[PDB]
Structure formats: structure tokens, C-alpha cells
Amino acid sequence: RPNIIYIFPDQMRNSAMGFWNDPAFASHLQGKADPVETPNLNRFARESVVFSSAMSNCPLSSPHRASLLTGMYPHRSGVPLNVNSRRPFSTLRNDATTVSDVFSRNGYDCAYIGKYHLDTPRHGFNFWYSYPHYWDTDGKRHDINQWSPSHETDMAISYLKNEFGRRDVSKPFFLMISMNPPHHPYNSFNDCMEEDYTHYKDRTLSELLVRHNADTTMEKSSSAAYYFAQITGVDREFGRLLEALDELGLSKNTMVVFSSDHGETMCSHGLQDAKNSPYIESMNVPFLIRYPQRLKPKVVDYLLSSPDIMPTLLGLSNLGQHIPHEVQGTDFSKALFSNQPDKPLPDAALYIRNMDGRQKVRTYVPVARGIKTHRYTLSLTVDKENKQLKEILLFDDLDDPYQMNNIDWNTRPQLKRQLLIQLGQLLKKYDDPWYKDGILKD
């Protein structure tokens, strides 16, 4: 029955949403909220289920998208590394059953808009508009200089109104929108609309970077206003979509999910090249579900993972009996619908980091694995050539939200037992390469 709109911008961390500053929400976000302007997401959060601890296990664009569409982790999804010609083996498995595959096979219209690029140089999607370079359902190339989130919202809205007859309105739809603001140039503020930047000019770095781990002396620190301004612009475009949903008869019977592929530390821990790291600024992503008829507005601390989105989506659409059987994710629909009447709710989520070994790269090395629980963060890194322990990251995220006190785990052996058992259980339950190769049998 229900329509589904899944909107996810790039590089938006969970802390960068204004309503995390309010008393009814702040106690659930790890650390201080970002001083960002997101009025539409603010109103949206009060009518939706807000996930405080949704995680991107592999905090990279391509691995998350593969895990989002397949409900499986980067070793089973086929994308453990960022999709690139120089890693031909990293690609969405053609013989995989995606979330759109199930929906389209169950009488849905399926539309994808934005950055895809999960194939090295469709899956039931009737409507295709990939991302200065866009491609139609026909293969038509469209070069438009309009700010990319604006153009993708326009195409999303026209699809919703059926302005051009690209969908059968007598069917439900599953519309995926990946909003792609342009950080590829960074430096110059050109890729920003005045309407959104105007909130962050005349703001000091101390006013912009409010998280205690933020290095306010970097060259990247001048980009903070740029980063927040595009988030504001994406929220503004998200509000346009919500108003469009209201002007049609769609708001009451549409499940609207807002998320992101990964976060952005943004000078947290003084991090240049701020991507693919176990820090909460890089792993915690937004996750909000507005299901007006079937979901009551609340805040949940579920450890949601990328492979968990597809089964949960299918479950929330009364399609829980059609989830493919090698889908490793967890269906949170029964927990979201009812009043906590289930036991096997995940206690921790995986963190995955891999890299290449060249000569043109055909294999990847599982150099880092870890778990994020309700209270703790653990991440273990090993040598590339000899899988021996190289680094240990342990943070008490309740007392150290900004992850500034790397606890030595030998000082707390009781916690070391708990977390190492949990990491092993997670690594085997999903059959991680750290299990195939038995990495760190220690």
C-alpha cells in the first residue's frame, strides 16, 4: 500500500541537524549538535521516528549504497571499496536482489535520482536519473548547471506530480533520491546558494565548530560554513519535497525516510581527508522515518546499520514476508510498529575499513574492524602485509562523547571481554573476511 521516498544527501553527519539542540532530543545525540540551520528537518523530526544511533558500518559512499540496496555487508554486497576503474572487482553484484527488485516485483513503480555509480567502468527502477551530467531513462545526457540538489528535487517533484507521465499513478512508488551537493571543488564558495550561505557568513570558527574535538586552526576550518550552508540548502530542498507531498494527496500515505551515506568529521580530531574513520562524526548518520498512519513520533537508540535499511523498509511496507533470504540485515519494522515485544534487537554494529593491494587492483585487505555499542566504540587496525595488531581504539562514548580519551583496554579487562566477544559474534554472524581468514584469532 504505502509509497516510499528515501532521501539521502552525501557527507551529512547526524549531529548536523538543528533539532538536536532542543531538550526533547539533545540527550540522545553523542555530543553537541552542530549550529546548523535546518528548519524543515526540525519540523520533520517532531512528526517522525528519529534514530539517534544509526550507523554507516563502512563510512564510504559506494559501500553504503551497495549495503543500502542489497541489505548485505561490503564483503557480500560486492562493493567493499569505493567504486573505481582501478578496483574492477568492487561492483554491485548483478545477480543480487535489491530493495527496488523486491518492490518492483511487488507492484511498485521504482525511481532512482542522483549519484549511483555502483558499477565499475537498473534493478527494477522504471525511472532513472543518475548524476553537470545527468542521464534519462532513455540514456539521454542532460548538462544543467543548476545547483544539483535543486535540479534533483525538481525532477523528484515532477515525478511525484506525474508531470511527464513517467509513472503509473494507480501503483505505489519507491523513489530514491541521493542529493549530491558539489564539494568536488571545495575552496571557492561558488557551489552555494546565497539563500543558504547567508546564515553562516559573519560567523566565527568558534561559533561554527562547537564540538570539543574540533581543531579550529586548520585550513579546512574555513570550509565549515560552506559545509553547513549546503546542508541548509539540502534541508530547504527537502522542505520543498515535503510541501509537494502535501499539495498532492500523498503526505498521509507516504513513508518518508531521510538519511545519509556517511558523516563528515569536519576538523574533528584535526582530521584532514575526513572520511572512512570510526569516529562518531564519521559513522553516525541521520535517520528519520515519517509514516503518518503506522508510526508514532518518538526517538529510538537502535543501532541501525546500512544492511538493516532494506529489510526494515520492506517490513515497514507490509512486505516483510518477501525479504530475500541471504539478506543479512535486521528488520526493525516489528520493533518500530509495536511496543518493544522482541528480544534479538542488535546490541552492537560493525565498523568496516578495507583498502587495495595493487597490480589493476583485484583484491581488498580487511585492515580494520570494530563495533559500536550503545555505550562504547572499539576499532582495531592491523598491518596490511601481516595481519597483526597495529592500533586499538576504545572510547566510552557516554563519558567521552567527543572521543578524546582513548582508553587502554588492559586497564579494563572486564570490558575487554565483553567487547571482544561482541565483535567476534558480529564478525561471524555476517561471515566477515576477518573470519574467513581468521584474522586476529587472538
Residue numbers in the entry: 31 to 151, 179 to 188, 197 to 424, 429 to 511
Q: What text appears in the publication on this structure?
A:
The structure was solved to a resolution of 2.85 Å in the space group of P212121 and iteratively built and refined to a corresponding Rwork of 0.230 and an Rfree of 0.276. The refined model contained 3 protein molecules in the asymmetric unit arrange as a trimer with C3 symmetry. The smaller second domain (C-terminal domain) contained a beta sheet consisting of 4 anti-parallel beta strands (β10-β13) and a long alpha helical region (α16) running orthogonal to the β strands but in the same plane as a solvent exposed structure. The superimposed structures had a final alignment root mean squared deviation (RMSD) of 1.105 Å, structural distance measure (SDM) of 11.021 with a cutoff of 10, and a Q-score of 0.797. When Bfo2290 and BT3349 were superimposed, it was found that many of the residues found in the binding pocket were positively charged residues or polar nitrogen containing residues with a positive dipole facing the substrate modeled in the BT3349 co-crystal structure.
Chondroitin sulfate A is a linear, sulfated carbohydrate linked to periodontal disease as the principal species of glycosaminoglycan appended on the surface of cortical bone of teeth and in supporting dental ligaments. Through genomic comparisons with B. thetaiotaomicron, a new PUL-like operon (Bfo2285-Bfo2295, and Bfo3043) was identified in T. forsythia and the crystal structure of two proteins from this PUL-like operon, Bfo2290 and Bfo2294, were reported using X-ray crystallography. As CSA is the primary GAG in alveolar bone, this likely serves as a mechanism by which T. Forsythia compromises periodontal tissues contributing to bone loss in periodontal disease in conjunction with host osteoclastic activity.
